[PDB]
Design a protein around this ligand. Structure first.
Ligand SMILES: NC(=O)c1cnn(-c2ccccc2)c1N
Ligand SMILES: NC(=O)c1cnn(-c2ccccc2)c1N
Ligand SMILES: [Ca+2]
Lengths: 276, 274
């Protein structure tokens, strides 16, 4: 096999450094490469955390995995330099309903297809690489609303949200990811926050362990949803209470492939224009 | 000290291996990866050190990973078969877009400028690696176009003559010459030295300071930022290498031009296409 090194970017090379999202993510431009970049940064000497993610991104290079451009490793500042995703996260697409009144079905299905393509690829690495922290927050969208999977901090070969975590991992597995995906799939097709009613996050955890899942009915998932039955089948088998009843991503892709072929090329382009 | 390795792809994983294009440095065939579930492109020729050439290109594509460079997915090296597995480019080359005028009647200005900016961004990145990696074979056939008509440059750092600077017949300044010619081609949709029969007549004309024609027939007065582009073109293909700009300079000239196009106008230029 052949080897490739991740470039070292001097901090001084990053211009127009502005805050983007809370480590912390900042937008910037590289003074020589003349492109916009995003920089994730903190500072402790237990900073192998930053170097580990960088190494993962660098080795997990693929079409649907956030491309890393370089490491910014200095005594003064430590950061990960990646491509800038101008359309943020899938979370913001699904839930900023004023800004995005419509998110057309072909786009929703392409996003789902692409999330699955990235994760599958990770799972097919040698040895398999598991995400373990899939959430709408980490599904980044480029200029044409194509998927780039990010956040490999909790990924292996204090925190936040719990709704995408399988019940078996509550007291800490190649089947964690699919559960997360299933919840994402549900959230994507509904534009509903999972366990919307339940305000107490610990209460959610109780319910989930008692077999409960987000509500699958006419109200959340309408009848007009393309391939509703085949999708609901996928969502349910994905978020199974039993880990062994959950499908691989390869299996899901095979299921999704003809579903994606039912949408004409132009509808993706139409969906993106509607959002801009 | 962070290092990434190029995956090895087993030939049996490459399903539906149908022919696509040829001549680049061998034959390019489209396929689909059986495990990854994505369309790919494969470049294949067995000779003695012709094998070392295929590995040399694969190493280059793998070391020169960037937003505007064709991403290499893996090498397919076996006693039976040898090929470079890259992403698939559904819109082919810049050459096809510019010259298939019945298929593409309108290639809106915003898209043309974006293609020009990206080609420059790609080459610039190469020139900024350590050591500087020179393209030396930049042509409209090498500029590939993805699903949204974004540029991916290919076939670089390996060495038609219409893009070759005159001094190269018998240099950090080679690529900018090619870029200047490409720019002229992109803005005019004409083939450079259209009325010239023999490639030797070109080579001779070029060496005498002759360049693709610049007037109202080739570059119509309604071209956005026309004066400005002509300058870039003329300094870029200047007879004297020293008088040609660096890609940095060229980018600084282009940046203000690209800012004048609204983000939506690129998308609308793309949807209009076949
Ligand atoms: N909006 C962006 O481009 C963005 C947000 N987070 N990240 C990110 C950067 C480094 C690691 C993980 C995510 C981006 N690239
Ligand atoms: N149409 C394509 O995807 C294409 C044409 N040539 N190449 C290519 C493949 C490997 C090396 C150089 C060019 C492609 N990927
Ligand atoms: Ca809107």
């Amino acid at each position: 096999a052949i080897c490739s090194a991740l470039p070292t970017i001097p901090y001084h090379k990053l211009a127009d450094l502005r805050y983007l999202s809370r480590g912390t993510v900042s937008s910037a431009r590289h003074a020589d490469w003349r492109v916009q970049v995003a920089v994730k940064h903190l500072l402790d000497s237990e900073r192998k955390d930053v170097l580990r993610e960088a190494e993962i991104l660098h080795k997990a290079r693929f079409s649907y995995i956030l491309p890393i451009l370089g490491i910014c490793n200095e005594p003064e500042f430590l950061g990960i330099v990646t491509e800038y995703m101008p359309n943020g996260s899938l979370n913001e697409l699904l839930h900023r309903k004023t800004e995005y009144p419509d998110v057309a079905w072909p786009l929703r299905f392409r996003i789902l297809h692409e999330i699955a393509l990235g994760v599958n690829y990770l799972h097919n690495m040698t040895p398999p690489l598991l995400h373990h922290d899939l959430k709408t927050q980490n599904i980044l969208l480029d200029n044409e609303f194509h998927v780039k999977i990010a956040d490999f901090g909790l990924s292996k070969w204090e925190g936040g949200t719990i709704i995408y975590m399988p019940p078996e991992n509550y007291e800490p597995s190649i089947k964690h990811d699919i559960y997360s995906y299933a919840v994402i799939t549900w959230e994507v097709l509904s534009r509903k926050q999972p366990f919307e009613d339940v305000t107490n996050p610990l209460q959610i955890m109780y319910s989930v362990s008692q077999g409960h899942r987000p509500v699958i009915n006419e109200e959340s998932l309408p009848y007009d949803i393309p391939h509703r039955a085949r999708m609901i089948s996928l969502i349910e088998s994905g978020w199974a209470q039993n880990p062994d009843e959950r499908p691989s991503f390869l299996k899901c892709l095979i299921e999704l492939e003809p579903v994606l072929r039912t949408f004409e090329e132009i509808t993706f382009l139409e969906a993106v224009i509607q959002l801009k």
